[PDB]
Amino acid sequence: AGPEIVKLKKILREKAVPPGTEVPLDVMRKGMEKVAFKAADDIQVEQVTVAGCAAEWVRAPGCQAGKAILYLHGGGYVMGSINTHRSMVGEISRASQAAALLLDYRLAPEHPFPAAVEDGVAAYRWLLDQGFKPQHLSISGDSAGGGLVLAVLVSARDQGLPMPASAIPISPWADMTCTNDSFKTRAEADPMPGGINKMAARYLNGADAKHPYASPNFANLKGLPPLLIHVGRDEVLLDDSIKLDAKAKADGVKSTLEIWDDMIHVWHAFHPMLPEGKQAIVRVGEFMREQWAA
What is the amino acid identity at position 140? S
Catalytic residue list contains 230: no
Query: Which of 96, 143, 171, 255 does the annotation list as catalytic?
Result: 143
What are the Cα distances from residue 131, in Å, to 35, 135, 136, 158, 249? 36, 12, 10, 21, 31
> What angle is formed at CA 29 by the lines to CA 28 and CA 33, rounded to 5 degrees?
115
Catalytic residue list contains 265: yes
Catalytic residue list contains 138: no
Query: Which of 91, 235, 255, 271 does the annotation list as catalytic?
Result: 235
**Alpha carbons within 13 A on the beta-carbon side of 115:** 17
Tell me how crowded residue 6 is: count the other CB atoms within 10 A of its CB.
11
Compute, in degrees rounded to 10, the torsion defined by CA atoms 83, 88, 89, 91.
Answer: 140
**Alpha carbons within 13 A on the beta-carbon side of 259:** 13
- What is the DSSP-derived secondary structure letter of residue 101? E
Query: Which of 73, 85, 230, 265 does the annotation list as catalytic?
Result: 265
Helix residue ranges, H only, 137-217: 144-158, 182-185, 195-204
User: What b/e readout covers 12-25, taking b as 16+ CB neighbours within 10 angstroms?
Assistant: eeeeeeeeeeeeeb
Is 124 in contact with 70 (CB distance < 8 Å)? yes
Nearest-angstrom CA–CA distance, 60 and 62: 6
Q: What is the largest CA-CA distance in the chain?
A: 49
What are the Cα distances from residue 33, in Å, to 27, 81, 85? 10, 8, 9
Nearest-angstrom CA–CA distance, 123 and 50: 6
- Residues taking part in catalysis: 143, 235, 265
